[PDB]
Amino acid sequence: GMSQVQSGILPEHCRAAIWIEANLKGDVNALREASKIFVDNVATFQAKFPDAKLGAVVAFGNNVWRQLSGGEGADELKDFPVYGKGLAPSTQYDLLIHILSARHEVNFSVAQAALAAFGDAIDVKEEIHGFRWVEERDLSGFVDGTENPAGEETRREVAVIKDGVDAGGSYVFVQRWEHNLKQLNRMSVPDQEMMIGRTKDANEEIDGDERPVTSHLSRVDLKEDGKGLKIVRQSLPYGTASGTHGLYFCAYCARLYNIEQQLLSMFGDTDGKRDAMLRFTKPVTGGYYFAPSLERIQALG
Ligand code: HEM
Numbered sequence: 001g002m003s004q005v006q007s008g009i010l011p012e013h014c015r016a017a018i019w020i021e022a023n024l025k026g027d028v029n030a031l032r033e034a035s036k037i038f039v040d041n042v043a044t045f046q047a048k049f050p051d052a053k054l055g056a057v058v059a060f061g062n063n064v065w066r067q068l069s070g071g072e073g074a075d076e077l078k079d080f081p082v083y084g085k086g087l088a089p090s091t092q093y094d095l096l097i098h099i100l101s102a103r104h105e106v107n108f109s110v111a112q113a114a115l116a117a118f119g120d121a122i123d124v125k126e127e128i129h130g131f132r133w134v135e136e137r138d139l140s141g142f143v144d145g146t147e148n149p150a151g152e153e154t155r156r157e158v159a160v161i162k163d164g165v166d167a168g169g170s171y172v173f174v175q176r177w178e179h180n181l182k183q184l185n186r187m188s189v190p191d192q193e194m195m196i197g198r199t200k201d202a203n204e205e206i207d208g209d210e211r212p213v214t215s216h217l218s219r220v221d222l223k224e225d226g227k228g229l230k231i232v233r234q235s236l237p238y239g240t241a242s243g244t245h246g247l248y249f250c251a252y253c254a255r256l257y258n259i260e261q262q263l264l265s266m267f268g269d270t271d272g273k274r275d276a277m278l279r280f281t282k283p284v285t286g287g288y289y290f291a292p293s294l295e296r297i298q299a300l301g
């Protein structure tokens with residue numbers, strides 16, 4: 001008489017991922033059976049490839065989730081708004097599939113299974129293949145992950161709803177960034193470090209009173225009466241060397257509130273200042289989703 005978290009929220013250090021964002025083409029009913037087949041497929045792939053350490057998440061946008069849940073729970077869920085009057089664009093879709101593991105080839109098979117399960121009920125808008133880069137660095141050359149919640153106990157505390165109808169569920173935020181590395185390389189390394197809030201090579205935190213308020217850490221390391229607004233990030237680099245490349249940003253949280261406060265800060269809605277990273281990278285997509293518990297996916301009928 002308890003809830004089980006979907007397998008893709010908590011795993012740490014996964015080297016590869018696939019994110020599929022899609023719109024519903026017909027009756028929302030199509031999503032009930034598809035979702036049940038998909039989580040079964042995941043169990044099958046986990047049995048066949050135990051060394052892949054595979055996890056996956058199926059999550060739903062506001063409109064379809066309100067329909068599937070009958071308006072019960074997910075009190076904070078809403079369509080992703082535009083932040084900064086447009087600095088952060090909004091591309092709210094109906095369905096998010098997140099697959100992650102130690103093996104991209106296994107991820108690819110799972111993605112094919114997801115597409116076969118939902119079939120022509122969905123219109124795929126984005127399919128992104130994330131990869132961990134050398135030293136877990138972002139393509140900018142700065143390490144990404146250092147202050148991310150560590151260990152299953154703390155990641156559960158931050159990401160997983162503890163009780164009520166939504167127990168075992170989580171709110172998800174996805175945002176694809178396009179890096180202009182040519183623009184970044186025009187910046188001196190000291191200026192880049194002041195833009196992030198950490199040193200580049202050694203990845204040492206620069207003190208809050210030594211870095212600009214526009215530094216990335218000053219924008220997103222937020223505390224309310226001394227309590228940090230934590231989130232569990234699953235972001236990874238993506239793209240080609242000669243084409244579009246950047247960071248696929250992905251975060252899970254028991255409360256959408258923590259994510260939103262960080263976006264209001266970054267995009268200038270809180271204090272009129274914006275994130276210094278906007279000097280070399282920009283967000284081009286944006287959406288909020290609700291990841292139910294595994295058992296609620298099994299009560300989709
Ligand atoms: C281009 C996009 C982004 C890049 C390249 C980026 C890069 C980084 C880097 C290098 C760090 C420092 C290492 C670490 O502690 O993980 C960091 C920290 C962090 N980022 Fe971002 N980030 C991006 C977007 C975002 C967004 C959109 C959010 C939230 C909405 C976010 C939230 C955070 C948080 C919460 C931390 C930890 C801060 C701390 O407590 O020290 N990031 N990011």
Ligand SMILES: [Mg+2]
Pocket residue numbers: 147221
């Ligand atoms: Mg801190």
